[PDB]
Write a protein that binds this DNA or RNA. Structure first.
Ligand SMILES: NC(=O)c1ccc[n+]([C@@H]2O[C@H](COP(=O)([O-])OP(=O)(O)OC[C@H]3O[C@@H](n4cnc5c(N)ncnc54)[C@H](O)[C@@H]3O)[C@@H](O)[C@H]2O)c1
Ligand SMILES: Nc1nc2c(ncn2[C@@H]2O[C@H](COP(=O)(O)OP(=O)(O)OP(=O)(O)O)[C@@H](O)[C@H]2O)c(=O)[nH]1
Ligand SMILES: [Mg+2]
Ligand SMILES: [Mg+2]
Ligand SMILES: [Mg+2]
Ligand SMILES: [Mg+2]
Ligand SMILES: [Mg+2]
Ligand SMILES: [Mg+2]
Ligand SMILES: [Mg+2]
Ligand SMILES: [Mg+2]
Length: 92
RNA sequence: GCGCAACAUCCCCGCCGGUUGGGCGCAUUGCACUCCGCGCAGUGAACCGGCUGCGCC
């Protein structure tokens, strides 16, 4: 789960929030500490309430669990965690 | 073929299916990298398959 290091995985999000509003209301919050490459969100039955954001490299992504970890985001605390594997765009 | 919905407890809304998006509810704490859980309804939204009826060649 936690404690490898590739990118962030945010959990326990408000699923009522639509995809577009969520994808941008995180980029505006998660670039205070790094540059964002791509943010990914799905409202499917599994990946709803979860997000996948990747930055420049690894400690361009350690700079996230860094900050938030229970941020009252849309009336529910965040829970961030390092992505177990790596996103298929950084494998190049 | 073209244009329409009279019939409607103000107006608007012919019928049956369906799609996309919006709403509410149930369920979901879930590690992905093209979409996709389900239910409810005057969804005063846009459309797709048909059909009934009215008017005009
Ligand atoms: N004050 C306002 O701002 C306001 C608001 C709404 C309407 N209006 C006016 O009030 C008027 C009321 O008109 P309406 O809505 O009663 O008529 P309509 O114009 O809606 O209906 C005419 C059509 O009904 C169809 N039709 C008639 N009998 C039929 C039957 N037996 N079977 C199937 N189809 C049939 C025909 O195709 C006909 O062309 C309108 O002309 C409108 O201009 C005014
Ligand atoms: N101009 C015109 N063409 C028609 C009319 N009715 C049928 N047609 C022609 O017929 C074709 C088939 O349409 P349909 O609705 O299946 O014809 P239909 O079933 O005989 O029509 P009904 O008489 O109502 O039963 C259309 O493409 C038209 O060209 C009409 O009233 N006016
Ligand atoms: Mg009409
Ligand atoms: Mg009318
Ligand atoms: Mg009427
Ligand atoms: Mg009615
Ligand atoms: Mg219908
Ligand atoms: Mg729906
Ligand atoms: Mg819904
Ligand atoms: Mg149609």
């Amino acid at each position: 789960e936690t404690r490898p290091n590739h990118t962030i995985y945010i959990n326990n999000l408000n699923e009522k929030i639509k995809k577009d509003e969520l994808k941008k209301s995180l980029h505006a919050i998660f670039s205070r500490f790094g540059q964002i490459l791509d943010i990914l969100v799905s409202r499917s039955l599994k990946m709803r309430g979860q997000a996948f954001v990747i930055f420049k490299e690894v400690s361009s992504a350690t700079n996230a669990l860094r900050s938030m970890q229970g941020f009252p985001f849309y009336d529910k605390p965040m829970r961030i965690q390092y992505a177990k594997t790596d996103s298929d765009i950084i494998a190049k």
